Ligand SMILES: CCCCCCCCCCCCCC(=O)SCCNC(=O)CCNC(=O)[C@H](O)C(C)(C)COP(=O)(O)OP(=O)(O)OC[C@H]1O[C@@H](n2cnc3c(N)ncnc32)[C@H](O)[C@@H]1OP(=O)(O)O
C-alpha cells in the first residue's frame with residue numbers, strides 16, 4: 001500500500017518511464033507556498049535543531065545511531081558511525097544547520113529520532129539539479145512502527161523546500177517506490193580468520209586463497225594533501241560526467257570529501273611531478289559486533305571514488321584492497337556501480353546478501369543498471 005509514500009511525488013511501484021523523460025513530478029513550486037510552521041509531533045515529543053559542531057548535540061546523535069541504526073538481517077552487527085565521521089558527513093560546504101533535525105522524548109529529554117540532509121548538485125541524465133542528500137534517518141528501537149518516520153521526512157522536506165530546493169537523492173537497503181537504480185554489494189575478505197570467527201563470512205587454505213598481494217601496481221600512491229585538490233577536482237570531475245547519476249563537485253567540495261581524516265576517509269593519489277593521474281578513496285564505517293566475547297568492532301572499508309589513467313581498473317582496485325589492508329581493515333566493501341562490477345570476480349570479491357537502492361525524490365526518469373551510477377552515499 002505504501003500509505004505514506006503513496007502521497008509523495010515519487011514514481012509508483014510498477015512505473016516505467018521512456019528514455020526521453022527527465023523532469024520533476026511536481027514543478028513550478030513556490031517557496032511562499034511551503035508550510036511555515038513545523039509539523040505537529042505527537043504529545044510528549046519535541047523538535048530539536050541539532051548543532052553537529054556542538055559536542056553535546058553530536059554526542060547525542062552518535063549515541064542514538066550507535067544504539068538504534070541499521071542492523072543486519074540476523075542482528076549480528078550494527079553500524080557504528082564515529083562522531084568524527086558524522087561531523088564530516090554533515091558539515092559539507094554550504095550545509096544548513098536547520099537540515100539536521102532531531103526529535104526528543106520529553107519525559108526523558110533524550111533524542112529518539114533524527115534525519116539529515118546536505119545540499120549537493122546532482123546530475124541526473126545529464127541535467128544538473130540542486131538537491132538535498134538525505135541520510136541518517138533513525139528512530140529509537142522502542143518507538144518503531146509508531147509512524148514517526150513519515151513526520152521526520154515531511155518536516156525535513158519542508159525545511160529543504162524553504163530553501164527553494166525541490167529534489168532529493170537518498171539510498172536505502174529496503175525497497176521503496178521506486179529505485180532509479182539498484183546495486184548489490186560485494187565483499188573482499190582481508191582478515192579471513194576474523195570474518196569467519198564473527199560470522200561475517202579449509203581454514204588454512206582460505207587464508208592462502210584470499211591473501212592480498214603485498215605490492216601495489218601503482219607505485220607512487222600517497223595520501224592526498226591539500227595541494228592536490230585542483231588535480232583531484234580535474235581528475236574526478238571529468239571522470240564522473242560519463243554516468244547517468246553523479247554529483248558535480250566544486251573545488252571546496254573536493255577538499256571536504258576527499259582530504260584524509262583518520263578512521264573516516266582515506267584518499268590516495270598518484271602525483272607524478274604535480275599531476276594527479278590516479279586516485280583511490282574509501283571511507284571507514286565500523287560495525288559494532290553485538291554480544292561477542294573476543295571482538296567488539298568489525299573494521300570495514302567502503303569503496304568511495306577510484307579513478308585511473310595510468311593503469312587498468314582491476315589494478316587500481318587491487319591497490320585499493322591492499323591500501324585498506326595496510327590500514328588494518330578487515331573487509332573491503334564495494335557496490336556494483338561505475339566500473340566496479342568488472343573487477344569483482346578476478347579480485348575474489350564475494351557476493352553480498354542484499355542490494356542498495358538509489359532513489360530520487362520528485363524526479364521522473366527512466367531507471368538504469370547500476371554500472372551507470374557514479375555516486376556513492378555515506
Ligand atoms: C525535496 C526534499 C525531499 C527530502 C526527503 C527525501 C526522502 C527521504 C526518505 C528517507 C531517506 C532515508 C535514507 C536513510 O537514512 S537509509 C537509513 C535507514 N535507517 C535505518 O534503517 C535505521 C534503523 N531503522 C530505523 O531507525 C527505523 O526502522 C526507520 C526510521 C528506518 C523506519 O521507521 P519505523 O520502522 O518506525 O517506521 P514508521 O512506522 O515510523 O514509518 C513507516 C513508513 O516508513 C517507511 N520507511 C521504512 N524504512 C524506510 C527508509 N529506510 N527510508 C524511507 N522510508 C522508510 C515505510 O515504507 C513506511 O511507509 P509506507 O510503507 O507506510 O509508505
Ligand SMILES: CNCCCN(C)c1ncc(F)c(N2CC(C(=O)NCc3cnc4ccccn34)C2)n1
Pocket residue numbers: 070071072073077078079171172173185285287302333334335352356377378
Ligand atoms: C554505508 N551506508 C549505510 C546505510 C546504507 N546501507 C544499508 C548500506 N550502504 C552500503 C553498503 F555497502 C551496505 N552494505 C554492505 C553490506 C554489509 O556490510 N553487510 C553486513 C553488515 C555488517 N554490519 C552491518 C550493519 C548493518 C547491516 C549489515 N551489516 C550492507 N549497506
